[PDB]
Hints:
The complex is a heterotetramer, with 3 copies of chain A and 1 copy of chain D.
Chain A: E1 3-4, E2 6-7, E3 16-20, E4 29-33, E5 39-43, E6 55-57, E7 64-69, E8 71-78, H1 82-94, E9 100-102, E10 105-109, H2 112-118, E11 125-131
Parallel strand pairs in A: 1-5, 3-7
Antiparallel strand pairs in A: 2-6, 4-5, 6-7, 8-10, 8-11, 9-10
Chain D: E1 3-4, E2 6-7, E3 16-20, H1 22-25, E4 29-33, E5 39-43, E6 55-57, E7 64-69, E8 71-78, H2 82-94, E9 100-102, E10 105-109, H3 112-119, E11 125-131
Parallel strand pairs in D: 1-5, 3-7
Antiparallel strand pairs in D: 2-6, 4-5, 6-7, 8-10, 8-11, 9-10
The structure holds copper (II) ion (6 copies).
PDB class: chaperone
Keywords: metallochaperone, chaperone
Assembly: tetrameric
Amino acid sequence: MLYLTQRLEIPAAATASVTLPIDVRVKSRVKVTLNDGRDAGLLLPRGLLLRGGDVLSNEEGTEFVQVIAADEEVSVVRCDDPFMLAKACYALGNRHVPLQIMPGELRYHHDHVLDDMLRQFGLTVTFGQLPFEPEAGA
Amino acid sequence: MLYLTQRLEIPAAATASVTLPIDVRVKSRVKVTLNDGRDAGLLLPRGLLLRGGDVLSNEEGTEFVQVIAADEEVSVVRCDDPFMLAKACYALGNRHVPLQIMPGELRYHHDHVLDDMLRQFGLTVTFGQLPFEPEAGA
Amino acid sequence: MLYLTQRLEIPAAATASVTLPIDVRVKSRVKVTLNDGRDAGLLLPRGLLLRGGDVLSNEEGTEFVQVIAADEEVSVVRCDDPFMLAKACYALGNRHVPLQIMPGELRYHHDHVLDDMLRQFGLTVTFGQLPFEPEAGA
Amino acid sequence: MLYLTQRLEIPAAATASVTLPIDVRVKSRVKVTLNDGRDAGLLLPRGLLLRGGDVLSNEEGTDFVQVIAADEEVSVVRCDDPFMLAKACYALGNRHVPLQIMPGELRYHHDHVLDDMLRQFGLTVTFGQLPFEPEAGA
Ligand SMILES: [Cu+2]
Ligand SMILES: [Cu+2]
Ligand SMILES: [Cu+2]
Ligand SMILES: [Cu+2]
Ligand SMILES: [Cu+2]
Ligand SMILES: [Cu+2]
């Protein structure tokens, strides 16, 4: 069976790819299915956060799988004013919410309670299936 | 003496003041001294946070006192890029560090550990004795 | 002709690849040959350093090209004792030599003058055709 | 008086000593004061680096003076990870910063600016007053 046991520090041309959500990209052992249909198992050393772009390889060196971050149910928070986001980041941080941070934009795992809370800060909160890359730590 | 038991919904006519730190403004029961030499006991309603500028009054509503936030030893963080202050606010939010958030500036109780950490983010941290008003929702 | 005009901040499943040496990966305008033969031209914003793993795409977003570091002539310096490697790293930095640093191995463009110098430090310098990813400081 | 014209490749019976910062230990023609009060004049061949512990002498070959490295203001980078130190050596090497290298620790003329740059590297940088013997090669 195809087992992906390593993440190459120096990539080699991809032979396959796999599109995974953040909850799977933090597991060291688990069964996933490549985008071409073949089953495969992750057998990586623990504590690795797989980011879109990383290349996994089988023990030998004949299979190089490109990791891609899947579209996940997230909440979006956009607003020209970064100061308001800064307060949102502090609030979300205080609640330990895995968060993606980019100039002008913020996303986090869909959660109604969180949505409405920020919906009292006056913040604009939408929803959509998008790639999710939270800041390291979870 | 004079008893302060309520906060007027509308900042009335001061005519006296009292300087208090963040740890005393998060109290409902406490005996203080007005900047004018008189003594007054604070008997405020539970579930409250006194902010600088606030105006306290007695029950019969015939006396008014203005609250002034005291100076405190804080680490100061100033930066031009709102993106970086956001990342800092999140990391600080995660450590449950009470924090005063402002456009382009952060303030928290002086801490060398937190200081070096933010320095690793390329932020420049300094020291100062300043009024500290940390976010209510923290 | 096919033109690659950008590096997505978020990789997408690659539909092709391109294997280039460090000197080319630092350019913004240059013609190249993808691994499937279809020639293509780079039209990227100046200032970028293409790293193995990056994904390039056009404007339409229908083509995604993965960059792979090409084998190049390099001097190979292997040595267990890290301490001695640190002294070589310092000496090479001093001479502004672009250097790849990994535990137990350093790599730089094949150069005899530098090969004889390190040899006097008691280092064993060999040769090879390998991927070269130097630190972003040269 | 006494004129020190040479460093012995054959240690002798040092009578007195002189404490100097690397600053003065690079000069071949400087007037110093032994720790006993007597003056001495260094007239050594050019291009010499006096190490704490060397012994100087007069043209005669009669008297001797031990060199001691003085305490200087230095930054300290103590990291148990040899891999990270090597990278630090490289960056510092690129900036032509005189550096003392040891397993687990690095030292160089204290410098806040330079310290912060190394902090962004994820390294811990402390301060000290210690002898300073930077690599001769630089
Ligand atoms: Cu929902
Ligand atoms: Cu907590
Ligand atoms: Cu301090
Ligand atoms: Cu050769
Ligand atoms: Cu230079
Ligand atoms: Cu200092």
